[PDB]
Amino acid sequence: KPIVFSGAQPSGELTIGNYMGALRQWVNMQDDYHCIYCIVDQHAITVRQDAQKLRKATLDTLALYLACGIDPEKSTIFVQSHVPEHAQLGWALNCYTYFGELSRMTAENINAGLFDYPVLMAADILLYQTNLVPVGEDQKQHLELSRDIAQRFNALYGEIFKVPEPFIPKSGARVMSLLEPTKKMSKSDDNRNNVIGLLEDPKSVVKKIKRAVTDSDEPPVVRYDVQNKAGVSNLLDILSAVTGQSIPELEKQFEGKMYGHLKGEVADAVSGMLTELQERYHRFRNDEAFLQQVMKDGAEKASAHASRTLKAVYEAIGFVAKRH
Amino acid sequence: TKPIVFSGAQPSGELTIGNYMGALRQWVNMQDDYHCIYCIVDQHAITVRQDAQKLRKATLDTLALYLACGIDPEKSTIFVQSHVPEHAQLGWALNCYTYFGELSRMTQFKDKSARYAENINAGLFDYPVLMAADILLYQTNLVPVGEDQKQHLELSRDIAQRFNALYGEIFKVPEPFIPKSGARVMSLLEPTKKMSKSDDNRNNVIGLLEDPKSVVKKIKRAVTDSDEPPVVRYDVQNKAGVSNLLDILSAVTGQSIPELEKQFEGKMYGHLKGEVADAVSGMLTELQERYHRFRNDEAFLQQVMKDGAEKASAHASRTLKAVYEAIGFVAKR
Ligand SMILES: Nc1ncnc2c1ncn2[C@@H]1O[C@H](COP(=O)(O)OC(=O)[C@@H](N)Cc2c[nH]c3ccccc23)[C@@H](O)[C@H]1O
């Protein structure tokens, strides 16, 4: 059974694009793979931020992943800082990473964490003998560095690490920005009218969907055409992703209908989906004991695996073994 | 409670009389006066590529050498860096409060990079941050080092101050403890270059575990100057070799430079080198005698490492817990 590693930032406010895209895909593959979800608080601190908001955001992210359907009895979910082995391997791998490799990632006032985090990312993955890593385009370089580091270390010391591969197949749910339908909906957009977050209430959803750009076709026609009708196509894709109705089925359903009707149904569909998600979220988020047990159990599972890899790394390097 | 002393040395190369005079001598002398913690920094050692068997052996060599010098495991905490995860943990966190420019300007990074062009690695660059973590974990007040580590120590102070300014009284701001003599012992055939523990030319070096007979021969061949008549006088600019020999002699015997200058009046470099050789040969003979008793007693070295890591972990975990609470991490259950 292959091992899958995903880093979850405790700062991102997840959108319907994040959910209906990758997360929903992965919630349904927890028996197919040994999935690991690491809430990366040690990566978060490369950007200076309020301490109390970071603690809150870590717990927010945990509860939301649980709400979306990550099962802590099937998958391993934990907070990065709870497993010392990440920092330990991070340091070790620094010594097998060229300074040039970090500088060549795509000046004097930048903090060393922002410079060095790709090595920590490599450590995060390689600790768990990870086979597969779902990456977006923005972190393809980082995965390649982790593969380069793994092969370099293995060439010196034997087959200590698995060489991880990208998880290639995409979710098959297309969710674009509401005011810029050529651009994908992304959690890190400054214009939050482009996105629908998972904790938005029905009034917020109605508002943002009514502002979503369409086209000046006369008569208005609800037909799928990414080139000529980007906005209307996005609303159709969003609706299809929520309900499971095909694009041709929806095109037939909205025959002789204006964009107001489409928008009305999209908002209703999206909010119907978010209601069950939000119910589970607030239930988990307000249960301190549950979250504490999930984190404790997750860190214990992670540590047991991570320690085995780190011991092999340390033995290969030649460090004197700790005396327990 | 007593103020805290922390210092470390790398289990790589072979420790010299420079390492001893600049650091280890002070370490031994501070043990009653302060609460002392001494570390074999194996995680720093691997910033220069090590053979795995050499690294393991050198770690244990270094531990036995600390004990041979007079570091007493009943008085001081003695441990191996990699045995305490908190070093790497705090090492990562302090990267986020250290600037790229502070690290790129470091003399050691530049010198080591020029030397090891084929392995200019991120560990070598990030070296000072892990060092700051090493110090700051133990609420350290004093850090006994040689002159060459002054720049690194200064950064650790800046990091402590910067972090404290944001979060409260989390770290002590450490102070350097650099000796008046022997802070920067120089190479015997190149006295404008500091004595290296990994020199390609062994004739530059007085190794702590080297045959005393070999060391005496090296002292006799140490370069001096062309002064006519020869005069034993301290002048680093014009008499680097003679000055370095006086510095070594002063550090061994405890005698001042004015005292030695007076003592060598009417004498030349034969007397100087004879006295340097006698003093150093005697020190190393004694040192090496103790060393083998410790080095071949694996049960004792194993127990010192166990007890030391236990003591260190108690201090380090406390500091790391406060750091993690301050920056906003969810506390581990
Ligand atoms: N020619 C010389 N003359 C006088 N002193 C010298 C000479 N060469 C070296 N030293 C001093 O020896 C100590 C150990 O040096 P290392 O290279 O092992 O090791 C080093 O240079 C440290 N980075 C190890 C370290 C890691 N973390 C720490 C925290 C606190 C103090 C020290 C450390 C040092 O005090 C060094 O200044």
What's the half-sphere exposure (Cβ side, CA atoms, 13 Å) at A173?
23
Comparing CA positions, the residue from B163, B160, B187 lying closest to residue B174 is B160
Query: Rounded to an integer, what distance in angstroms lies between the CA atom of residue B328 and that of residue A191?
Result: 27
Nearest Cα to A41, choosing from A13, A14, A9?
A9
Cα separation of A146 and A165, whole Å? 10
* HSE of A154, CA atoms in CB hemisphere, 13 A: 15
How far is B257 from B233, CA to CA, in rounded Å?
9
CA neighbor of A235 nearest in space, from A255, A115, A226: A226
A151 DSSP 8-state letter: H
CA B16 to the chain's CA centroid? 10
DSSP B255-293: --HHHHHHHTTT--HHHHHHHHHHHHHHHHHHHHHHHHH
Q: Are B121 and A95 a contacting pair at CB < 8 A?
A: yes
Alpha helices in chain B (DSSP H): 17-19, 25-29, 42-45, 52-69, 86-95, 100-104, 107-115, 122-136, 150-167, 212-220, 240-253, 257-263, 269-295, 298-327
Q: Which of A41, A113, A320 is closest, CB to CB, to B80?
A: A320
B176 touches chain A (CB under 8 A): no
Task: Report residue A182: phi and psi, to 5°.
Answer: -75, -30
First to last CA, chain B: 29
A321: Cβ contacts below 8 Å, ≥ 6 apart:
A311, A314, A315
**According to the annotation, is B76 in a ligand binding site?**
no
Beta carbons within 8 Å of A10's beta carbon, 6+ residues apart: A39, A40, A41, A44, A54, A57, A58, A60, A61
Pairing of strands B4-9, B35-40: parallel
Residue A37 CA to residue A49 CA, distance in Å, equals: 23
- Compute the distance between CA of residue A210 and CA of residue A241 in angstroms, rounded to an integer: 19
Q: Which helix (H) or strand (E) holds A194?
A: none
Q: Which residues of B are catalytic?
A: 112, 194, 197
To one decimal, the resolution in angstroms is 1.8
Sheet with B77-80: list strands edge to edge. B77-80, B35-40, B4-9, B142-144, B175-177
> Which DSSP letter does residue A184 get?
B
Contact B333 A55 (CB under 8 A): no
Disruptive mutation site among A291, A323, A324 for chain B (greatest number of B CBs within 10 Å):
A323
What's the sign of the alpha-carbon dihedral A45, A47, A52, A57?
A: negative
Phi then psi for residue B120, to 5 deg, are -85, 90
- CA-to-CA separations, B207 to B20, B22, B52, B70, B142, in angstroms, rounded: 10, 14, 22, 17, 26
**How far is the centre of ligand 1, averaged over its atoms, from the C-alpha of B108 (Å)?**
11
Option in A41, A110, A116 nearest B122 (CB): A116
Collapse the DSSP code of B294 into the 3-class scheme (helix H, G, I; strand E, B; otherwise coil) and give the result: helix
H/E element holding A159?
none
**Measured between alpha carbons, how far apart are the two ends of chain A, in Å?**
33
Which ligand 1 atom is at minimum distance from the Cα of B6? 30
The token duo for A198 is 């998972």
Yes or no, beta carbons of B99 and A82 under 8 Å apart: no
Tokens of B122: 């991120």
Q: Chain A contact for B300, CB < 8 A?
A: no
Which SS3 state, helix, strand or coil, does residue A34 take? strand
Alpha-carbon gap, residue A320 to B62, rounded angstroms: 12
- From the CA of B215, how many Å to the nearest CA of chain A? 30
* Backbone angle region of A258, left / alpha / beta, with phi > 0 → left and psi within -120 to 50 → alpha: beta
In a 3-state reduction of DSSP, which class is residue A77? strand
| Whole-number Å distance between alpha carbons of B215 and B192 | 20
Q: Which residues are B8's β-sheet partners?
A: B39
Q: Which of A10, A294, A90 is nearest to B328 (CA)?
A: A10
CB contact under 8 Å between B92 and A55, yes or no, is no
Amino acid present at A177: S
Which residue bears the tokens 């030397």? B115
B1 vs A36: CA distance, rounded Å: 45
Residue identifier of the C-alpha nearest atom 30 of ligand 1: B7
- Contact present, B115 and A113 (Cβ < 8 Å): no
Find out whether the beta carbon of B37 lies less than 6 Å from any atom of ligand 1. Answer: no
B322 to chain A: which residues are within 8 Å by CB? Answer: none
C-alpha–C-alpha distance, residues A234 and A249, integer Å: 15
Closest CA to B81 of B17, B20, B12, B150: B12
Instruction: For residues A139 and A159, give the distance between their C-alpha atoms in angstroms, rounded to a whole number.
Output: 25
Ligand 1 atom, smallest distance to B146 CA: 37
Looking at beta carbons, which residues of chain A come within 8 Å of B97? 111
Closest atom of ligand 1 to CA, residue B148: 37
CB A99 within 8 A of CB B122: yes
Number of Cβ atoms within 10 Å of the Cβ of B154: 13
